[PDB]
Amino acid sequence: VVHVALLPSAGMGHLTPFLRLASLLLHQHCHVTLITPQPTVSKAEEDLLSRFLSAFPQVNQLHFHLPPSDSTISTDPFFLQFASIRSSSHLLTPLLSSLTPPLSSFIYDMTLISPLLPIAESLGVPHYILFTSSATMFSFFAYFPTLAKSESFPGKLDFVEIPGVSVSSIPRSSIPPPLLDPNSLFYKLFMEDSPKLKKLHGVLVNTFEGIEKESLEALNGGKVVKGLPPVYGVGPFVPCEFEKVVKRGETISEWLDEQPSGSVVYVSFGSRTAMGREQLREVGDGLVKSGWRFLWVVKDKIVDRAEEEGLDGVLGFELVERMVKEKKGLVVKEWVDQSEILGHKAVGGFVSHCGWNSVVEAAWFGVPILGWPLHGDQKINAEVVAKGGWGVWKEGWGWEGERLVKGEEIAEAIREVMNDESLRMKATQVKKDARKAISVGGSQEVALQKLMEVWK
Amino acid sequence: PVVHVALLPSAGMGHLTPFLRLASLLLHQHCHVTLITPQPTVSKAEEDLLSRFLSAFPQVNQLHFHLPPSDSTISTDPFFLQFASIRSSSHLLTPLLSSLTPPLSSFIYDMTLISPLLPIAESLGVPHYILFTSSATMFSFFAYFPTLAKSESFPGKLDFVEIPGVSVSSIPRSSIPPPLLDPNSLFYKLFMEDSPKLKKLHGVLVNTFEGIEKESLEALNGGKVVKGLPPVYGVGPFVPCEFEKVVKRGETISEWLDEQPSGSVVYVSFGSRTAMGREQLREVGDGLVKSGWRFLWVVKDKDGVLGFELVERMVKEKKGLVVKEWVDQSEILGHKAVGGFVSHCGWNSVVEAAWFGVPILGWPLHGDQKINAEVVAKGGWGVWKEGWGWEGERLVKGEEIAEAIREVMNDESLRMKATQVKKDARKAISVGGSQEVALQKLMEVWK
Ligand SMILES: O=c1ccn([C@@H]2O[C@H](COP(=O)(O)OP(=O)(O)O[C@H]3O[C@H](CO)[C@@H](O)[C@H](O)[C@H]3O)[C@@H](O)[C@H]2O)c(=O)[nH]1
Numbered sequence: 044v045v046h047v048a049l050l051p052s053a054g055m056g057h058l059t060p061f062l063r064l065a066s067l068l069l070h071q072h073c074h075v076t077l078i079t080p081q082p083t084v085s086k087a088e089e090d091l092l093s094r095f096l097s098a099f100p101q102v103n104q105l106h107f108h109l110p111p112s113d114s115t116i117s118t119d120p121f122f123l124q125f126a127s128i129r130s131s132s133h134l135l136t137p138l139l140s141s142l143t144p145p146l147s148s149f150i151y152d153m154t155l156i157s158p159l160l161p162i163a164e165s166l167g168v169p170h171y172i173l174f175t176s177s178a179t180m181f182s183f184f185a186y187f188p189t190l191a192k193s194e195s196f197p198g199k200l201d202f203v204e205i206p207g208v209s210v211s212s213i214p215r216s217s218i219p220p221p222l223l224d225p226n227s228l229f230y231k232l233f234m235e236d237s238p239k240l241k242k243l244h245g246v247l248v249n250t251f252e253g254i255e256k257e258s259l260e261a262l263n264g265g266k267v268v269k270g271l272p273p274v275y276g277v278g279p280f281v282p283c284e285f286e287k288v289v290k291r292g293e294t295i296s297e298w299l300d301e302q303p304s305g306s307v308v309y310v311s312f313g314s315r316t317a318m319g320r321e322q323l324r325e326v327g328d329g330l331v332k333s334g335w336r337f338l339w340v341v342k343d344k345i346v347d348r349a350e351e352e353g354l355d356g357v358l359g360f361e362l363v364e365r366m367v368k369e370k371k372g373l374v375v376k377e378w379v380d381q382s383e384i385l386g387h388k389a390v391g392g393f394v395s396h397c398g399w400n401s402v403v404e405a406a407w408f409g410v411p412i413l414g415w416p417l418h419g420d421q422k423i424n425a426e427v428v429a430k431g432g433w434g435v436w437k438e439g440w441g442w443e444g445e446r447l448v449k450g451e452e453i454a455e456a457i458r459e460v461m462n463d464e465s466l467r468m469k470a471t472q473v474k475k476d477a478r479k480a481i482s483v484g485g486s487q488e489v490a491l492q493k494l495m496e497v498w499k
Numbered sequence: 500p501v502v503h504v505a506l507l508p509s510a511g512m513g514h515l516t517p518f519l520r521l522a523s524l525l526l527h528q529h530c531h532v533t534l535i536t537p538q539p540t541v542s543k544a545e546e547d548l549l550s551r552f553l554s555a556f557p558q559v560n561q562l563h564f565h566l567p568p569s570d571s572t573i574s575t576d577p578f579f580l581q582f583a584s585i586r587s588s589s590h591l592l593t594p595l596l597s598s599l600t601p602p603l604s605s606f607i608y609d610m611t612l613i614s615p616l617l618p619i620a621e622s623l624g625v626p627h628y629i630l631f632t633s634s635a636t637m638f639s640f641f642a643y644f645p646t647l648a649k650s651e652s653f654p655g656k657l658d659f660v661e662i663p664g665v666s667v668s669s670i671p672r673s674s675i676p677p678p679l680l681d682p683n684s685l686f687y688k689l690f691m692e693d694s695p696k697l698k699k700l701h702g703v704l705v706n707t708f709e710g711i712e713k714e715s716l717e718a719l720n721g722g723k724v725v726k727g728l729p730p731v732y733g734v735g736p737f738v739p740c741e742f743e744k745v746v747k748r749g750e751t752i753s754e755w756l757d758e759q760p761s762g763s764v765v766y767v768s769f770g771s772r773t774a775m776g777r778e779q780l781r782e783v784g785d786g787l788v789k790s791g792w793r794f795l796w797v798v799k800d801k802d803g804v805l806g807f808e809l810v811e812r813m814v815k816e817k818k819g820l821v822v823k824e825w826v827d828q829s830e831i832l833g834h835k836a837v838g839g840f841v842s843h844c845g846w847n848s849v850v851e852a853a854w855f856g857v858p859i860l861g862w863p864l865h866g867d868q869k870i871n872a873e874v875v876a877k878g879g880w881g882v883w884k885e886g887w888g889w890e891g892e893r894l895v896k897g898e899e900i901a902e903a904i905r906e907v908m909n910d911e912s913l914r915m916k917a918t919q920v921k922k923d924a925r926k927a928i929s930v931g932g933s934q935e936v937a938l939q940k941l942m943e944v945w946k
């Protein structure tokens with residue numbers, strides 16, 4: 044009996060790939076202990092966890108209760124759990140060592156590598172990180188101590204050239220701004236965590252050769268960093284049935300059934316809102332001006348804090364009236380089944396902030412992407428898609444809040460992506476490779492067996 | 500040799516519309532009409548309607564009545580500011596009217612201007628009248644108010660105002676405009692000064708007819724409201740005219756109505772202007788989606804009013820439209836898809852609903868609207884809820900609103916009565932109808 048322990052970080056962007064990896068390991072007949080930091084931050088995490096545990100009642104949920112963290116750096120509830128874990132991870136050792144059956148391996152989130160590395164070494168089992176973003180973004184993370192020691196860093200630097208990765212030249216404009224400030228916490232965490240990769244037994248990435256061939260080969264051939272552990276491309280993590288909410292109104296699917304094939308552009312900027320009010324108006328104005336059918340999924344401005352503000356409060360009355368007249372667009376404020384949407388033949392395009400889970404899903408369903416990266420890794424992820432030729436993004440729009448992107452710019456970008464058959468044909472090729480990756484003898488099965496060979 | 504009539508409307512679409520429709524009726528009787536236009540006109544809606552009217556009837560002489568701007572200490576209401584200017588600059592009219600060819604035969608001015616215009620009309624020496632733009636029952640209340648004010652029970656003790664023989668026999672205290680219950684109010688003083696001046700007119704024109712206000716028309720002309728009141732001419736219904744149609748209007752509203760089952764749409768409009776708070780408007784949208792009926796909601800310009808679930812149902816279910824524009828209300832009320840009218844019960848909308856046989860869910864907000872709503876309810880082609888209160892008194896919730904909408908839309912007794920009111924409205928404008936008879940009686944003394 045192979046026993047694997049899993050510890051995701053906070054946020055749907057981390058919990059979703061971890062529960063999909065858990066599903067993959069259960070199919071390989073592993074016994075899975077899912078470590079759950081408590082109290083969980085968001086309701087969406089609560090609901091997905093209960094839906095997951097219901098679908099797989101054989102998995103053992105180990106509750107990891109966290110004392111309250113009071114930090115002067117940030118009040119964000121997601122950051123405060125992260126602060127709790129790296130100050131109170133000593134509590135995990137008794138819960139993990141005194142555990143039956145004996146653990147065979149430990150897989151935790153890459154963001155928790157500093158607190159969890161001594162915990163894993165005290166358990167004496169093969170331990171790994173699951174990185175929830177692209178292999179190209181991981182290459183940047185692994186290369187960062189080398190990059191920060193250059194005299195070009197930070198002012199002179201124009202392009203970051205990491206040997207052999209899928210994005211050969213990363214401009215300074217695509218680097219997350221805090222990583223250019225040696226005084227930022229982000230910079231400090233990268234400089235502390237990246238050298239610890241050598242202590243790991245391996246790195247798991249939700250990616251496949253069909254989208255990141257160069258980055259995966261560069262990471263595994265000692266090209267990016269000397270002494271890196273093996274990097275396992277175990278993607279794509281395909282959506283699972285337990286994610287689907289049990290009782291949905293079906294009205295979104297019923298609306299998609301009434302549109303022509305490839306007619307609808309789907310817009311989602313991620314699990315949470317990272318976009319200001321003035322920019323959100325311009326988004327709705329751009330969708331109406333584009334002339335294309337659209338399904339725009341918006342989130343609550345603050346997580347789990349609903350408001351009575353109308354859609355004309357956000358977008359303005361005339362924009363809303365023109366929308367209901369032309370009959371071409373839906374705007375919903377809810378947690379949708381994004382896989383049901385991307386898998387529908389009426390959807391011909393995806394306006395995405397390029398969070399990596401949404402990028403892999405679009406690859407799985409062969410939907411071309413109009414990238415609107417906002418923060419963090421998203422500009423690097425968007426260029427991974429652009430390099431593959433199944434997506435496009437406007438590098439001049441900037442990080443979120445740098446400038447106001449007008450509705451006419453947005454409409455012209457939408458019309459560009461929705462009319463480009465070259466992007467659609469390349470996305471269909473990416474989809475074919477994504478389907479091959481999870482077939483029998485495909486890259487995902489090969490990579491999983493290579494992991495399972497050590498465990499037992 | 501021609502009969503010449505001068506018309507002076509007060510500010511607002513609720514006053515210009517009946518006056519221009521009266522002008523159309525008078526032009527059909529071969530009168531030469533002079534339209535006195537207070538300038539600058541307050542709203543753009545009045546501008547565009549006036550130009551469409553003059554363009555349709557180029558034989559009408561427009562006399563511009565230039566007014567000095569009232570001061571900021573007078574009011575923030577642009578319609579009261581025109582009132583204040585007219586009261587002080589009415590002396591200007593006497594030169595313009597006495598030096599007018601062909602000489603004037605009669606003079607019809609808005610009732611709200613009866614105080615500054617009465618001495619002007621008497622110097623002209625022609626028969627002069629008021630056009631009251633609201634219901635005959637509301638007029639009976641206005642004419643009876645000096646009698647009511649000199650009562651012992653006025654104002655605190657009174658529970659019901661009983662005007663002898665009118666269409667609504669007992670007007671509850673809760674239906675009286677609140678300022679008229681305050682003997683120190685400005686509204687009170689204007690009522691007390693203007694009402695006795697009615698006895699100095701040659702007659703009163705009301706946009707009404709026997710089909711909707713038989714009792715109060717009888718009581719007014721029978722001396723039962725005020726002894727020696729001049730004759731009251733029921734010259735309604737004022738029907739929509741062609742010049743009101745905007746020549747190049749979109750068809751999104753009509754095309755949407757053409758796709759709905761007959762009698763399935765609730766039309767919702769609270770009048771010519773905004774008169775409802777935002778948190779209340781948010782409940783109107785919730786009530787429309789909760790009612791389950793198709794709706795056409797017209798909103799007037801003054802956090803959002805259009806909730807997310809409301810917009811979703813309009814796009815997925817195609818259940819509703821919400822517009823913020825000057826719609827063609829007559830085209831909407833005349834469409835067979837429309838089966839109900841949620842109205843603030845401004846009198847022109849009431850008469851139009853009667854003209855098209857559309858039952859009314861009354862939601863009175865200010866002034867005469869509770870009295871008008873009961874005129875409809877007494878006729879049996881409408882319903883209103885007394886407990887909702889004046890605008891802003893309390894928050895009427897969406898579930899209350901949805902319940903009232905489902906009541907009116909399902910009530911065939913109201914629809915059949917509205918069809919009967921419509922048949923009387925059509926009869927009133929036919930040969931030998933009450934409108935013709937009242938117009939000939941009104942014009943017999945004009946030379
Ligand atoms: O209405 C919704 C919204 C989201 N999802 C799902 O939720 C996941 C969202 O994940 P992702 O696309 O990564 O968005 P975020 O979670 O916002 O992305 C965060 O996490 C990513 C992975 O670490 C990073 O790449 C991003 O920069 C970071 O913002 C996806 O699987 C979606 O299918 C839904 O099912 N319905």
Ligand SMILES: O=c1ccn([C@@H]2O[C@H](COP(=O)(O)OP(=O)(O)O[C@H]3O[C@H](CO)[C@@H](O)[C@H](O)[C@H]3O)[C@@H](O)[C@H]2O)c(=O)[nH]1
Pocket residue numbers: 511512513514516632633768769770771772797824825826827828829844845846847848849851865866867868
């Ligand atoms: O979008 C619109 C709105 C209104 N109308 C027309 O404008 C007129 C509105 O007149 P009315 O129904 O009287 O509304 P208001 O002008 O708001 O009513 C005011 O004036 C009335 C007549 O004096 C009074 O009875 C009311 O209490 C007072 O609020 C009607 O003919 C409607 O057909 C349109 O054509 N389109």
